[PDB]
Motif scaffolding. Structure first.
Motif, PDB file in Angstrom:
ATOM      1  N   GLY A   3      11.554 -27.813 -12.075  1.00  0.00           N
ATOM      2  CA  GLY A   3      11.370 -28.928 -11.163  1.00  0.00           C
ATOM      3  C   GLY A   3      10.316 -28.606 -10.126  1.00  0.00           C
ATOM      4  N   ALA A   4      10.549 -29.040  -8.890  1.00  0.00           N
ATOM      5  CA  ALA A   4       9.621 -28.793  -7.793  1.00  0.00           C
ATOM      6  C   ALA A   4      10.066 -27.570  -7.009  1.00  0.00           C
ATOM      7  N   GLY A   5       9.132 -26.659  -6.765  1.00  0.00           N
ATOM      8  CA  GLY A   5       9.450 -25.457  -6.020  1.00  0.00           C
ATOM      9  C   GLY A   5       8.402 -25.150  -4.973  1.00  0.00           C
ATOM     10  N   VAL A   6       8.654 -24.114  -4.185  1.00  0.00           N
ATOM     11  CA  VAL A   6       7.721 -23.718  -3.141  1.00  0.00           C
ATOM     12  C   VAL A   6       7.145 -22.332  -3.411  1.00  0.00           C
ATOM     13  N   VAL A   7       5.854 -22.194  -3.130  1.00  0.00           N
ATOM     14  CA  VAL A   7       5.137 -20.938  -3.282  1.00  0.00           C
ATOM     15  C   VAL A   7       4.753 -20.511  -1.872  1.00  0.00           C
ATOM     16  N   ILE A   8       5.140 -19.299  -1.492  1.00  0.00           N
ATOM     17  CA  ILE A   8       4.837 -18.762  -0.169  1.00  0.00           C
ATOM     18  C   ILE A   8       4.034 -17.494  -0.434  1.00  0.00           C
ATOM     19  N   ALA A   9       2.761 -17.531  -0.052  1.00  0.00           N
ATOM     20  CA  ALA A   9       1.836 -16.441  -0.335  1.00  0.00           C
ATOM     21  C   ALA A   9       1.365 -15.579   0.827  1.00  0.00           C
ATOM     22  N   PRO A  10       0.839 -14.387   0.513  1.00  0.00           N
ATOM     23  CA  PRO A  10       0.333 -13.424   1.493  1.00  0.00           C
ATOM     24  C   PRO A  10      -1.155 -13.625   1.776  1.00  0.00           C
ATOM     25  N   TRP A  11      -1.648 -12.960   2.813  1.00  0.00           N
ATOM     26  CA  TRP A  11      -3.052 -13.072   3.180  1.00  0.00           C
ATOM     27  C   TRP A  11      -3.947 -12.002   2.569  1.00  0.00           C
ATOM     28  N   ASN A  12      -3.370 -10.947   1.996  1.00  0.00           N
ATOM     29  CA  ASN A  12      -4.211  -9.876   1.466  1.00  0.00           C
ATOM     30  C   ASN A  12      -4.954 -10.180   0.164  1.00  0.00           C
ATOM     31  N   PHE A  13      -4.381 -11.029  -0.683  1.00  0.00           N
ATOM     32  CA  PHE A  13      -5.049 -11.459  -1.914  1.00  0.00           C
ATOM     33  C   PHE A  13      -4.811 -12.959  -1.948  1.00  0.00           C
ATOM     34  N   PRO A  14      -5.419 -13.674  -0.983  1.00  0.00           N
ATOM     35  CA  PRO A  14      -5.320 -15.121  -0.798  1.00  0.00           C
ATOM     36  C   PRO A  14      -5.946 -16.032  -1.831  1.00  0.00           C
ATOM     37  N   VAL A  15      -6.649 -15.459  -2.800  1.00  0.00           N
ATOM     38  CA  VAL A  15      -7.186 -16.274  -3.875  1.00  0.00           C
ATOM     39  C   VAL A  15      -6.367 -15.906  -5.114  1.00  0.00           C
ATOM     40  N   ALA A  16      -6.364 -14.626  -5.478  1.00  0.00           N
ATOM     41  CA  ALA A  16      -5.632 -14.165  -6.658  1.00  0.00           C
ATOM     42  C   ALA A  16      -4.130 -14.437  -6.683  1.00  0.00           C
ATOM     43  N   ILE A  17      -3.394 -13.907  -5.712  1.00  0.00           N
ATOM     44  CA  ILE A  17      -1.945 -14.096  -5.705  1.00  0.00           C
ATOM     45  C   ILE A  17      -1.546 -15.541  -5.434  1.00  0.00           C
ATOM     46  N   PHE A  18      -2.275 -16.190  -4.536  1.00  0.00           N
ATOM     47  CA  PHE A  18      -2.026 -17.588  -4.205  1.00  0.00           C
ATOM     48  C   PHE A  18      -2.160 -18.412  -5.493  1.00  0.00           C
ATOM     49  N   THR A  19      -3.254 -18.199  -6.218  1.00  0.00           N
ATOM     50  CA  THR A  19      -3.508 -18.926  -7.459  1.00  0.00           C
ATOM     51  C   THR A  19      -2.474 -18.621  -8.541  1.00  0.00           C
ATOM     52  N   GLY A  20      -2.218 -17.338  -8.782  1.00  0.00           N
ATOM     53  CA  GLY A  20      -1.258 -16.960  -9.806  1.00  0.00           C
ATOM     54  C   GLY A  20       0.137 -17.529  -9.607  1.00  0.00           C
ATOM     55  N   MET A  21       0.647 -17.436  -8.382  1.00  0.00           N
ATOM     56  CA  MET A  21       1.984 -17.931  -8.085  1.00  0.00           C
ATOM     57  C   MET A  21       2.114 -19.436  -8.230  1.00  0.00           C
ATOM     58  N   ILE A  22       0.994 -20.143  -8.120  1.00  0.00           N
ATOM     59  CA  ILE A  22       0.993 -21.592  -8.261  1.00  0.00           C
ATOM     60  C   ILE A  22       0.834 -22.023  -9.719  1.00  0.00           C
ATOM     61  N   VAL A  23      -0.216 -21.533 -10.370  1.00  0.00           N
ATOM     62  CA  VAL A  23      -0.493 -21.964 -11.731  1.00  0.00           C
ATOM     63  C   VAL A  23       0.471 -21.500 -12.813  1.00  0.00           C
ATOM     64  N   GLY A  24       1.166 -20.385 -12.592  1.00  0.00           N
ATOM     65  CA  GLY A  24       2.132 -19.921 -13.578  1.00  0.00           C
ATOM     66  C   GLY A  24       3.229 -20.968 -13.733  1.00  0.00           C
ATOM     67  N   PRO A  25       3.933 -21.318 -12.645  1.00  0.00           N
ATOM     68  CA  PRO A  25       4.997 -22.327 -12.721  1.00  0.00           C
ATOM     69  C   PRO A  25       4.466 -23.692 -13.171  1.00  0.00           C
ATOM     70  N   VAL A  26       3.309 -24.078 -12.646  1.00  0.00           N
ATOM     71  CA  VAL A  26       2.709 -25.360 -12.986  1.00  0.00           C
ATOM     72  C   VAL A  26       2.334 -25.475 -14.463  1.00  0.00           C
ATOM     73  N   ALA A  27       1.843 -24.382 -15.041  1.00  0.00           N
ATOM     74  CA  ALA A  27       1.429 -24.376 -16.440  1.00  0.00           C
ATOM     75  C   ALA A  27       2.514 -24.846 -17.397  1.00  0.00           C
ATOM     76  N   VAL A  28       3.755 -24.448 -17.135  1.00  0.00           N
ATOM     77  CA  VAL A  28       4.850 -24.816 -18.019  1.00  0.00           C
ATOM     78  C   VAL A  28       5.609 -26.082 -17.641  1.00  0.00           C
ATOM     79  N   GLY A  29       5.075 -26.843 -16.691  1.00  0.00           N
ATOM     80  CA  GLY A  29       5.710 -28.103 -16.338  1.00  0.00           C
ATOM     81  C   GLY A  29       6.363 -28.281 -14.985  1.00  0.00           C
ATOM     82  N   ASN A  30       6.325 -27.258 -14.144  1.00  0.00           N
ATOM     83  CA  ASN A  30       6.901 -27.372 -12.810  1.00  0.00           C
ATOM     84  C   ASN A  30       5.841 -27.931 -11.871  1.00  0.00           C
ATOM     85  N   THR A  31       6.272 -28.343 -10.683  1.00  0.00           N
ATOM     86  CA  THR A  31       5.336 -28.815  -9.673  1.00  0.00           C
ATOM     87  C   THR A  31       5.546 -27.889  -8.480  1.00  0.00           C
ATOM     88  N   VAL A  32       4.510 -27.737  -7.667  1.00  0.00           N
ATOM     89  CA  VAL A  32       4.552 -26.792  -6.563  1.00  0.00           C
ATOM     90  C   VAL A  32       4.036 -27.266  -5.214  1.00  0.00           C
TER      91      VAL A  32
END
Ligand code: NAD
Ligand code: NAD
Ligand code: NAD
Ligand code: CL
Ligand code: CL
Ligand code: CL
Lengths: 516, 516, 516
Positions: C175-204
């Protein structure tokens, strides 16, 4: 992968009391049902007509097994409208959903197997085991195609990748087509030719043979109960040269799936090659025609085994099989031994009303009887009649197992499909000549070789040009999945039924690329 | 599995000095040989004839680029005899051996690619990169089919086992057939249509298009050096309606592989459906015909990217491609932005002698020039000419990139294949109407969509009814293996070239059972 | 299978003139845009707010690099509504369609990588290569998850069949979830934590770290251009303890994907275990927290190789990595040789404005500077300061590479995550004690061993209890796909990023049986 692996439906032998009891009750109920009327099935509903088709009992033609409505051009148009409308959404069903629908239909058919077998006994004159084999094959087609269809699911094509792009190739169904079926295997072939195309997303207008319209209607009762959406499958019993030809030549018919005589198959293939006015595609036509099948026996064979297999292959269902052994090619050393054994076994065959479960029932109709008897008269002036060759007493269309010997390879009875209980025996010098004679016909459907010599069997594996070849066993009874069925030359287009390749015939491929 | 995984042959861009030098050298060598005469190739030897065929340089028609022998009925018969004799043994070659022969041919072609490219430049007016792409695709077909053929090797069919029996199903080639090819891709398509059937055991009689007989002969020089057994491949340059039709209608031709116009394809498909006197099989005919391909652009697209792809697709090889964008469908929001960009890019295209590597060379012949100019006149009465529409100065058949706007979807120039540098622009309300207009033609070969909206792309993936669909890129240049090539509707029989499925079309299946 | 096999995006080294020129151009473009304001992104549109968030340049904190909107409870509620509305249809998209959307996003990110790298340089103080590695990893996550998601497509579960039934098990998104990310890898980790769940049908609903709100906004510009449907991904920059906690505790938040400090991770995991009023599910919470990573070096190691790897691991991105080597465990024979080499290399490291590509830029904020300096004071009371330990001149938060020796294993600086350029050196007797000390912390993220002794390496493979272990190389820079990333113990829940298993965390399974 969500159901058990495919297994063939067992063919009932009726050797147990339970089986006999069940069959006797089924036969009694079908007989008590004689005279029932079956309408057309168009767009999910049964539709009646003023005119009708009459189906007689070949074992007692004064008896009407049943009648059905009769489809004309108007009904064909209504079916086309329904089939194309249904195609619009049916093509988009997930394959898993379409396959589950087929599995449901198979379960329903299995639960009504005795009834269907009994209907075959009365409508087309099959004895008990022949009827059971027919229905078992129909169930097999449904079970097999339901599973095979999943192998083509989106996106099934193996392609080479390209940098920065997604390249996806997949199959899509063709549209609405017509199925034109024969009367000899009115449950099995009728079912297979319909469900294969339907399984992968096509819609069908089915035209049963005139002599088997009642059992065709019962198959549709099963489709209706299973829940196929309106228009996906339509039942149009009627005259072949009328409604059948009308659909074959129609600009809006996408494909034609036909099984029948070479004479008709040639006409259909030619018509399919023409662009009807307003037609916007190249029609696909699959035509599986007749055969003039031979069994070769050399001097190294088990003569008793060979004779038994020859008799079964030649006289099963009165020789009314595209796979029937109508030619027996014997090398010099096998001639006397095999022919004597074949004659001894054949003369003990019982002939009578199909309900009595005789070795041979009647041929299917008065016209078929006339044709077979005509070929027997021709044969008397070509070869030497050594067994049978006469119609038996009785109202039914009973013909005695017939054997002609010393038949010239080019004689009409050694070249033309008689489709009756008539075997032509040809004497040759050696195995090489046996293969030459076996191959020298316009057909190439089934063939067999009885021999213990490995070199002869492997030689035949390469050079006996038939689509279905059998060694040291009968040449009839191809099993779905085990023996892809279909011939070469004028036996057809080689559309192998009961094989993975069959479904590909009813699909086209789309390749979609996205550059990111 | 004994060679490296398939990879597409790189298309030369001529960005390096060495590449340009190599091309100049090849062009010189080829023109120095303009006086050469190429005989027919039958039964492993070059055979000359009394009459000949002349090939002209479309960039300077007073210049002859070569002459070839001319095949008549007698030569067709000789080729048939050779092809069937060869088939008898070629069909029995282990697949590994046949595949290695193809790989050898590919290696030889690769070593002569500059020569072949230069021949294309002079004989059919392709610029440098178009010529390189053609030859690269030919090499790809050989490399791909050599590998794909092994996937069908004995015994390749998946069957269900049965107790006490060995059940083996396998593929066998059909026999001798005829290949009738087009002049627009006289190396690639000519090669693919020949080697695909040959790879799996068939033999072929190849009939090159009249306008590309010289390059076809050079391809056969490669087949000869590779060592194909006598009769396996035969070269019969001649008149389509003469020797081509003769073979198509012949009772001893097993299959027909055709790529060309719809007009001719319809006649071939119809003829193939007939049983010629003495014919003993149902002929297989594969016909890939023309297309009236459209590119849809909506308001969310990258207009500059779209304009570039449209110009490449519409004017590459002067629009003489079955995949060429001949229709540009613009939604209202994309109309002005895209049209303006397309016109600006198109007006900068150069036109001249192909050897100087212009954006556009000449159309292939005086006949093609006549046809294209005639359609331009028709277009002036249906739409609004906004660019080009004129013959350019010079003996060569130079036609300027042409654009017609406000073209009715049902207009002749929006429905019929012009096969020239003529683009018809159609304005539509929204994406739904864009798809309706895109699908409303008798064809279904290629199509494209430029859009950033995911929903529109996936919608088109399902509803834009063409065999080869491309998103956000040119719609021409399908790569072997990556994009199975072939259309729907009157674009052909959907024989997907450069795909595993292609080879299945030239095989039939045999099922052999042995009861132990 | 429709795209090229996954390959990691190359990390730019800037060794060429073109690369350096391209970076200078990107840096100029980015700083020219320092005055930009980035709104929230909710339901497919950019939505502004009254209050804002300011982002400063850590290399010159008086310089603002950008401002963004500030999300409060009202905006969180709006995002929730949009995310759940979108989920209703996004969950039904074919996986192939969702994966293509990700691939489009990756292509767009790749085309803007210099811009993103330059933004990282200015917003979080990464030098050139650290910035390039960050963006490359983000691209990798998108490319990897797009492909991995297809491995779970309908119906992916392997089940045991049952007679007369179809049994189908498949995955469905949560379903719909929340992604809370760090500032040290603000492109890589931010992106990964979002697109992984989204790829399989979740919203973020994505909540970027306060210190990296600008680059997070730029990532959303890419998601917007890619075309994710409204509500599928939402951007909510704001205060962690405010909007972040609000979503974590919300009854309508289905899952929480968190990467950050242990302190916060503990609170989130505890909150996720509670049933908020009206909640109808057990929340899933994935928390990847800090680490106190050690590199062990024994006397058999290549001391020069070890020293280089230690310096890279300890001081890369100023030690602000969850994988950073903050402990150096040296056996007695390796102590002096390695320590001497480490000090010599460390003393040569440059520290200054990140844009000048120094070995070390500044720590990210005044708060981080305060924390690191505080730990340095604590260290002076626990171990022996032998290098650095001072703030360097300038407004920017520059801290010198620091080394403490003779540090007790139980000391605060040997147990607590400092997240700064501070290395603690511990002397041990042998390898056994080295492993004991390595394992004796509450964490278990990364670890390394420099040794030539096979028995020690294989011993560590089994006994060094960290999720990511490296031998004879740096312990930072885990590559997507190559090294599934995630720890043990208080380093998190072991949600392995860049691995097939990651996506399973955002799916639930359904088993459906049909009895025919
Ligand atoms: N190859 C196989 O798998 C196979 C299997 C079973 C039967 N057969 C062949 O079928 C024949 C026996 O069946 P049959 O007597 O029903 O064959 P048939 O050709 O006389 O009729 C077959 C079907 O075609 C219809 N038909 C007749 N004339 C038509 C026309 N002009 N246009 C369109 N449809 C027309 C009929 O009404 C019936 O539905 C034999 O030749 C037998 O070998 C072949
Ligand atoms: N679908 C595809 O993959 C594809 C690819 C390339 C070209 N094409 C089509 O090919 C056409 C251009 O090629 P073309 O001008 O050579 O086409 P064409 O149809 O005029 O001729 C094709 C070939 O057929 C021969 N031919 C002509 N009349 C014949 C007859 N009555 N019987 C037998 N053979 C006959 C010709 O000599 C030539 O070899 C266009 O319509 C184009 O779209 C299609
Ligand atoms: N395990 C890993 O893969 C990994 C990777 C990178 C960073 N980290 C860890 O992350 C930390 C550095 O990142 P940081 O300083 O941003 O961490 P942090 O825990 O201080 O903040 C992380 C995120 O949580 C939010 N937040 C803060 N308090 C919150 C609360 N009460 N409720 C909800 N959200 C709240 C912040 O605003 C930010 O978005 C270090 O411990 C480091 O080791 C771990
Ligand atoms: Cl054969
Ligand atoms: Cl389609
Ligand atoms: Cl462990």
């Amino acid at each position: 992968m969500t159901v058990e692996p495919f297994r063939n439906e067992p063919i009932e032998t009726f050797q147990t009391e339970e089986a006999r009891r069940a069959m006797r009750e089924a036969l009694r109920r079908v007989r008590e049902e004689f005279g029932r009327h079956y309408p057309l099935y168009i767009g999910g509903e049964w539709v009646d007509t003023k005119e009708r088709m009459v189906s007689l009992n070949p074992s007692a033609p004064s008896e009407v097994v049943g009648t059905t409505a009769k489809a004309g051009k108007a009904e064909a148009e209504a079916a086309l409208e329904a089939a194309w409308k249904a195609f619009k959404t049916w093509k988009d069903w997930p394959q898993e959903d379409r396959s589950r629908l087929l599995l449901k239909a198979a379960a329903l058919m299995r639960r009504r197997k005795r009834e269907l077998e009994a209907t075959l006994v009365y409508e087309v004159g099959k004895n008990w085991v022949e009827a059971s084999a027919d229905v078992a094959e129909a169930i097999d087609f449904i079970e097999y195609y339901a599973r095979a269809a999943l192998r083509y699911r989106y996106p099934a094509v193996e392609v080479v990748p390209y940098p920065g792009e997604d390249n996806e190739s997949f199959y899509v169904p063709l549209g609405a087509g017509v199925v034109i079926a024969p009367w000899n295997f009115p449950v099995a072939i009728f079912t297979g030719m319909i469900v294969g195309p339907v399984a992968v997303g096509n819609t069908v207008i089915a035209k049963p043979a005139e002599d088997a319209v009642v059992v065709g209607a019962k198959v549709f009762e099963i489709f209706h109960e299973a829940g196929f959406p309106p228009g996906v499958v339509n039942f149009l019993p009627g005259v072949g040269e009328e409604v059948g030809a009308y659909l074959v030549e129609h600009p809006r018919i996408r494909f034609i799936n036909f099984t029948g005589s070479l004479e008709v198959g040639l006409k259909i293939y030619e018509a399919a090659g023409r662009l009807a006015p307003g037609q916007t595609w190249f029609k696909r036509a699959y035509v599986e025609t007749g055969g003039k099948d031979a069994i070769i026996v050399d001097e190294t064979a088990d003569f008793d085994l060979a004779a038994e297999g020859v008799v079964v292959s030649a006289y099963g269902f009165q020789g009314q099989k595209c796979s029937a052994a109508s030619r027996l090619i014997l090398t010099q050393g096998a001639y006397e031994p095999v022919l004597e054994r074949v004659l001894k076994r054949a003369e003990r065959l019982s002939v009578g009303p199909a309900e009595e479960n005789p070795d041979l029932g009647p041929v299917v109709s008065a016209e078929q009887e006339r044709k077979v008897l005509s070929y027997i008269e021709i044969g008397k002036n070509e070869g030497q009649l050594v067994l049978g060759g006469k119609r038996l007493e009785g109202e039914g269309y009973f013909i005695a197992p017939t054997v002609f010997t010393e038949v010239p390879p080019k004689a009409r009875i050694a070249q033309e499909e008689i489709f009756g209980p008539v075997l032509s025996v040809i004497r040759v010098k050696d195995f090489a000549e046996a293969l030459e004679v076996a191959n020298d016909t316009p057909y190439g459907l089934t063939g067999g070789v009885y021999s213990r010599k490995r070199e002869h069997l492997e030689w035949a594996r390469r050079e006996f040009h038939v689509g279905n070849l059998y060694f040291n066993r009968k040449i009839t009874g191809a099993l779905v999945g085990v023996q892809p069925f279909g011939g070469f030359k004028l036996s057809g287009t080689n559309a192998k039924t009961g094989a993975l390749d069959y479904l590909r015939l009813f699909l086209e491929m789309k390749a979609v690329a996205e550059r990111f």
